[PDB]
Design a protein around this nucleic acid. Sequence first.
RNA 1: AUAUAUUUAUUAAUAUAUUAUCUAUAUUAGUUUAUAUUUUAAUUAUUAUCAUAGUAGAU
RNA 2: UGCUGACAUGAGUAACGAAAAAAAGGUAUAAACCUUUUCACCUAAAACAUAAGGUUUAACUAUAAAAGUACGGCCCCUAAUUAAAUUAAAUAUAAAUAUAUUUAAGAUGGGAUAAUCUAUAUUAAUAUUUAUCUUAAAAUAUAUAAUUAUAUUAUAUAUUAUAUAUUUAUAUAAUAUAAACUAAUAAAGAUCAGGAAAAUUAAUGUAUACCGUAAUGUAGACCGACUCAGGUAUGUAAGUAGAGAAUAUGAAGGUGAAUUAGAUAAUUAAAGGGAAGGAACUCGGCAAAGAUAGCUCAUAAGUUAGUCAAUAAAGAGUAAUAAGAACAAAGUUGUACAACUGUUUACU
Lengths: 50, 65, 113, 112, 98, 156, 206, 46
Amino acid sequence: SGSYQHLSNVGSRVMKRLGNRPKNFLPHSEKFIKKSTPEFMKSDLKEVDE
Amino acid sequence: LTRPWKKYRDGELFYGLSKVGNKRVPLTTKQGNKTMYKGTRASGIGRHTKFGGYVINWKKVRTYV
Amino acid sequence: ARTKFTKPKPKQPVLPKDKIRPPTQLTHHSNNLRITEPIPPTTSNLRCPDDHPLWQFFSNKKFIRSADDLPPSSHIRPWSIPELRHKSFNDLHSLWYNCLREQNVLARENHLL
Amino acid sequence: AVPKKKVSHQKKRQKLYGPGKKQLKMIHHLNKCPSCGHYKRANTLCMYCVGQISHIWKTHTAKEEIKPRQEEELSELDQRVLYPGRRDTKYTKDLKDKDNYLERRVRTLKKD
Amino acid sequence: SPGLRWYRSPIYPYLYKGRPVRALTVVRKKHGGRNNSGKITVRHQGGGHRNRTRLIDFNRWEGGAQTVQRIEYDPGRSSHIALLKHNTTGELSYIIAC
Amino acid sequence: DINVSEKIYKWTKAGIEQGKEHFKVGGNKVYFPKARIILLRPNAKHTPYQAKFIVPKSFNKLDLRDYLYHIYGLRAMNITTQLLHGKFNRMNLQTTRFREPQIKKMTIEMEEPFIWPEEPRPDENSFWDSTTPDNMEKYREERLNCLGSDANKPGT
Amino acid sequence: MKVNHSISRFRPASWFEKTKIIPPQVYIFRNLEYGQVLYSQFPNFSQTQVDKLFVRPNWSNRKPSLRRDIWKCMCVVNLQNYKQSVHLYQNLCRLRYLRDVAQRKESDKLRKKDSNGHVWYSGQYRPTYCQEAVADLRESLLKVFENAAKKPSIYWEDPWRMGDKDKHWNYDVFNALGLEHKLIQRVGNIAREESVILKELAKLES
Amino acid sequence: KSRGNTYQPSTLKRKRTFGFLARAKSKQGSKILKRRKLKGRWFLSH
RNA sequence: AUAUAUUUAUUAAUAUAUUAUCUAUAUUAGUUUAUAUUUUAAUUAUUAUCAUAGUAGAU
RNA sequence: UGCUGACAUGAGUAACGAAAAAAAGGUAUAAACCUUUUCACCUAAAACAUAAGGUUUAACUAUAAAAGUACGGCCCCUAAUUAAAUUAAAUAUAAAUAUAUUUAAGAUGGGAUAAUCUAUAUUAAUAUUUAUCUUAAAAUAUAUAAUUAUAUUAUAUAUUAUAUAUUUAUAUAAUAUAAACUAAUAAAGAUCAGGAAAAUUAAUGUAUACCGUAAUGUAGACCGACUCAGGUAUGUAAGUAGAGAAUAUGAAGGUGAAUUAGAUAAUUAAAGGGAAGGAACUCGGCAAAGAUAGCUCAUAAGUUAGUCAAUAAAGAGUAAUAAGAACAAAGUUGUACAACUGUUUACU
C-alpha cells in the first residue's frame, strides 16, 4: 500500500460519508465490489449491517 | 517522453491525477511562510527567552512513571 | 571593447627572488598515492547483545508472528471489569504497562503489514 | 474556409475510398529468405537472420560486467544491513513492467 | 540639465549643517491626504522625504534669558528653529527664529 | 568552574554510572500513558547503533527519551525528530481531497548496537507474503478498468 | 578586529607547535544527509574546508550544506607528531581530489552501481563515499608511515565502520607502529556534546 | 501586458482575508459563516 | 607511473602498450591572477567546434 | 441561434507550442526509457544556492536528523495598521455602528554570547544620499646641505627576534603581490534634512523545547483553462577580453525535450548575397541599407552661457593599407506644436 492512513483518522467526514452509504444506493455500491472480487472469494448472500 | 509508455497526448498530467481541488482545507506544519508556525501540541514545556532562546521548566515536563 | 587599436597590457609586477618570503609549508602530499577500492563496513566488528532492550519490541525475536505464533481468538479473552475491580493499584499499573508493551509490538508488526 | 453543408455519406466515402492513391496496395514484392525459408521483403534482409547474427555478436563481443570485489564478498546479513529494500514509486513500477509497453519483433510465415 | 535653470534658492551660511537634537524631535506620521475615513480628504497632498517634527515651543513660558546654541532648518516650518539653551537652568529647547 | 555543555556531559555520565536516568526527570507524572511507538526498520543512512520510531505527533523528544527509559529500559543518548509532510490523497476524483497524516519519526542513538531479524520467506510466514494482496489489487484494477473488448482479453 | 581563527587557514606543524590547541590528530566527519565525508585539522570546520574538498560537485556528489546538525564525527585519528598529522591530512585531500577530478573514472568503476547504472543510493544518501573515506584514510596513513614514543591510534565513532580487521587494517607497518583501533566513549549525547567529547579525547593523549 | 494571472498566491494574505478566524472576528464574516452553515457547506473558510 | 615483453640481473636496463601533464603552500579578510614553493606535471606538426556560413577573397 | 444527452460533418484534415543529433548496449523488445562514448546548446545561465507557491511533484514509505556561533522560525520589541477589546455619564449615532483614548495584536524591520567556543534563566540590591578628493605623510630613482620621479598609504596575518610573565601570556620591532570585492574605521558634501520600540552589577542556575529542513523554484513540480515562447523575488555566478555583469568563448555543471522519418514543388515566414542603375517605390524612403576606433585630441553657427548645442558635424594620431569576430556607435537642416525630465487610453 505505502499508506500511513492506518496511523491516524484523517479526512474523517469523507470516510463517514463513504462508510455510511445510503441504503437505496447499496446495489450501486456492491455491483462494482462484486465485479472486483474473484469467483472463489465472492458470496451470493447479502452482507448485512452490524 | 515524460513517461515512455505514453507516446501520444492523452489528457494525463505531468504529476498526479488532477491539478484542481478543494483549496479550503486546514494548514499543516509544512505550509505557509517562514513566519507561519503551526505547532503539534508537543511543547508547552518551558518558557521563551527575551533573546529568542528557550528555558525548560522541569516541573512542567512529562515523565512516564 | 577590444579593438584593432588596443595595445596589450603590461605584465604583472613580480616580486624579486631575494625579497620573496619562503613558504611556511615545504613538503606536500605523497606522489605515490593510489585510488584503492572502498572498504565497506562489516557486521563482524559489532557485538550486538542477545539482551538488547530493543528486542522487547519483538516477540521471540520474530520479524513477524505467523498465524500459528499468534494467540488464537478462542483461547484469549480481554479482562472483565469486575475482575479488574479486585486488583491492587500497583498490579493494575503493571498490567497496563504490559498491555502498552503488547500494543507496541503489535503496532510495529501491524504497520509493517 | 468553412464547409457550407454537412458532407453526405456518399461524397465523403467516394472521396476517401474511390481513388487508388488513397487505398492500400498488396505487398506483391515478398520473397523467400535464403538463410531461413520465410517471407521477407524483396531487396531487403531477413529481420530474423540479421537479428540472430546481432545476438551472436553480442554474446561473443561482450564487455565484461564490473563487479566490485568488496560488494561481491559481503555477507548476506551485512549486505542487508548496508543496502536495505525500498518501496518503488508508481512510475518506477510502471517503468519496470516493460512487457506492458515494449514490442518484441514477430516472426514471419514460412514460404511455400 | 534644463531643470536646474530655474532652481533658485536662498543661501544662509550661518545656518547649522548638522542633525537636530534627537530628544526634541518626534516622527512625522504621513497621512497623505487621507483621513481616518481612509479617503483623500485634502486633495493634492502626497509623499516626500522621511521628515521628523521638532517640538518647537510656541508659548515660551519658561522665563529668564537663554543663549541660542544654534539655528537649524526644520523640514516643516518655512521658518528657522533655534536651540535656545537656558543660560542658567541648563536645558535645550527650540523657538521660531527672528 | 566549568562550561555548560561540559557540566551537562558530566551529569549524563553520572546518571549512567548510577543506573539512574541520564537526564533530569520532569515533575508532570503520567501514570497511565496511552502512547504507542512503532519501531521502524533501519535506513541505509543509519548505523547499527541507531533505531528509528514512529511516535505520537504530540510526542516530545524528552518525552520519548523518558518513555524509552522507563517503559523499556533503553537509554537514548541523542534523539532527532522528523515530522513528515502529509501529501494530498483522494479515494476517487469525485470525492473531496484531503492530506494524509503528518507523521512524526524520531531517530535515537544508543550505546549498544542492534540489527533486525531477517524477514521471512514467502513459504514460511502466512502474513508477510505480498504476492496475494498485490494479485488481488491487480485483478480489481483489471476488472473495474476493463471497458469493452478487454473483457474477452485474458487475465494477468 | 581579528578576522582569522585557527580554522581560517591551513595550519602547518610549526603553527601547531607554537599554539598547541589540540594534540597531533586529524578529525573526520560523516554527513548524515548525503553520506559524504569531511576531513579537518581541527574539531570544528568552516565553509572554507567544504569549498576545498567539494570542488567538482554534481547531482551524485552534491556540495554539502554547512548546517551543523547533519555533520557528525566519523573518526578521530591521532598520530605521533603534528607534522605527521599535517601530512596525513594533505594525503587525504589529495586522494579526494583524485577521486573527484583527476582519476574520477577509475573511482566510478570501483564503486557499487544500481540498476540504471547509478552509484547506489537511498534518498540522496550514498553509502560509498564513507567507505571510500575509510579506504582513503587507510591508504594515506600507510603512505605516511612508509615516508617515516607515542603509539598512534584511530578513535572510531562506531566499531562496525571497519571493513574487516583481517582483510584490511592488518598491514605489517601498522602492526609495527602499534596502531590501536579504539572507539569514542558513548556515555552521553554523542551528537550534542560532541565537541566536549573531542576535547576530553584530546586531553587524554597529552 | 498579458492578463489572466490575477491570482497571485501568498498563504499569509489569504489567511488574513479569507481565513476562518477573520470571518469569525468580524460581524459580517460571522454572518457569512452562519449562512454557509445553513446552506450545508463543508468548507466555511480558507 | 602501471601492464606486459625483455638486456639482463627482485631490480636496473631494453622494448612497446596504456595512463598522465595535475596537484599542494605562502605573499595580513575573500576572490582571481602573478611569482617562489610543491611536484613528472612537456614544448613544435596537424585538426575540430563556436563566434550571423565568425568575417573576408574567390568560386 | 430552444435545453440535456448521444453522435455526426469538416477530417484522419490542421497541429503536435522556439531546440541537435549519432551510435553501442540495456534488451535476438526502445526514434521517445536507462548506461557508456561522440557532437551540440545554455553559461551575470537552460549552472549552484535560495524566497514565495503548490495534486510529494523527491535520489520515497526501511522518507526530507538542529542548544547556539554565516539557522531560520518560535520568542522579545515595535512600523504601516487592525481590533462584538478598552475607558449614573469616554463622545457621537434610526439599529448597524462611528470617533477619541487606552489596551492587545501586526514583519517586509530591531534583537545577548560565542571556536583559545558560548550560556539566554530565577532572585537581592542600585545610520537620506554621496564621497573617500586634495593635501600631507612614509617610500624606490635621482642623486647621492636638493630638486624632480612615480607609485605607498586606516584597518584584518603568519613568521622571526626580542621584550616583558613564567612553554603558554602579551607587547615590541623585522621581512612580506597586482587586481577586484567585502566587513569594522575615520574624517566629510549636498538639500530633499533622513523610522519606531525592548538598567546595572553581584549571587544563584542552565540534565538544552517545539517548527521549517526533500525535490521544485528564469518552471514539466507555482500564476496564466494546456507539461502554455507569457508572468515569477535573491546571492553566487570558471577562466581568457575588455571600461564593463557589454560582446566572443566557455572549465565545470546541466541539458538535447510527448512526435519522428523523408522531402525540400508552388507558396509563406526568418536569414545571407546581388550586375547596371540609385527612391524611378510609395500615402509617406514603411522595411531594409548606411558606422573610415569605442580611445586620445579637436570640435562651429546659435544661445537662456549650461561643451546647452555636443557623443556636434567634419578632421586627427594609435591600428590599417585588397580585405580577413562579435558587441556600443546611425547624418544634417527648415516648419508646425509643445519649454523641459516626465504622465496617459493594462488589450487599436
